[PDB]
Amino acid sequence: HHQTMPSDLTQDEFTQLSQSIAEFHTYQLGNGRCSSLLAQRIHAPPETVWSVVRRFDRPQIYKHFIKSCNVSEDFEMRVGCTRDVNVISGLPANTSRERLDLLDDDRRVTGFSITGGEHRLRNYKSVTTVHRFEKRIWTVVLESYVVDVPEGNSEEDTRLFADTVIRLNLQKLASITEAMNR
Ligand SMILES: O=S(=O)(NCc1ccccn1)c1ccc(Br)c2ccccc12
Numbered sequence: 659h660h661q662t663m664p665s666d667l668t669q670d671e672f673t674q675l676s677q678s679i680a681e682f683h684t685y686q687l688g689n690g691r692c693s694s695l696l697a698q699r700i701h702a703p704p705e706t707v708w709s710v711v712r713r714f715d716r717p718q719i720y721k722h723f724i725k726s727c728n729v730s731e732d733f734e735m736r737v738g739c740t741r742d743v744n745v746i747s748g749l750p751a752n753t754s755r756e757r758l759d760l761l762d763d764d765r766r767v768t769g770f771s772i773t774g775g776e777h778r779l780r781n782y783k784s785v786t787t788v789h790r791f792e793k794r795i796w797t798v799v800l801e802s803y804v805v806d807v808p809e810g811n812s813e814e815d816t817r818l819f820a821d822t823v824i825r826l827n828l829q830k831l832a833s834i835t836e837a838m839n840r
């Protein structure tokens with residue numbers, strides 16, 4: 659018997675989601691890369707959670723640390739389209755340019771890449787999936803990513819970093835989506 663964190667999946671969680679992990683949240687590692695997987699349980703229906711997560715043009719809605727995110731005018735939210743996001747002042751990243759890779763309203767799957775900008779997460783690729791859970795009906799959100807490990811940094815350092823941003827983001831996501839409830 660061991661000890662995991664709360665971002666790591668529980669057993670019941672993993673047995674239901676394993677296939678999803680197999681398909682969407684698994685990356686080719688090795689050679690200065692690193693990846694990670696985070697879960698968040700949310701006492702709200704998947705449909706609500708998905709509608710927020712999918713808003714590629716308005717990540718501010720739940721991601722932290724965004725001063726602004728501009729898309730273009732002839733911007734239609736569809737695969738290949740992009741967003742220029744500006745981070746608040748005082749952080750170790752100023753701007754990010756991200757491309758939408760993946761948008762499936764049927765399977766509630768989405769993902770973007772960073773291509774890139776003023777920061778040190780080179781070639782970051784993320785995927786986020788939402789799932790239904792029953793026993794009283796809740797949601798589980800999985801977010802994973804892979805990204806390059808910068809010159810004089812450890813892979814553990816890089817994972818810690820990305821993990822934190824994602825972890826807080828999902829907490830915000832949880833928070834607003836549970837917010838109205840019923
Ligand atoms: O532009 S982002 O909103 N990208 C979304 C994002 C970026 C990285 C991890 C998870 N999610 C963003 C926010 C905060 C930090 Br620190 C970032 C640092 C580098 C690049 C982008 C950054």
Ligand SMILES: [Br-]
Pocket residue numbers: 750751776777778779
């Ligand atoms: Br950075």
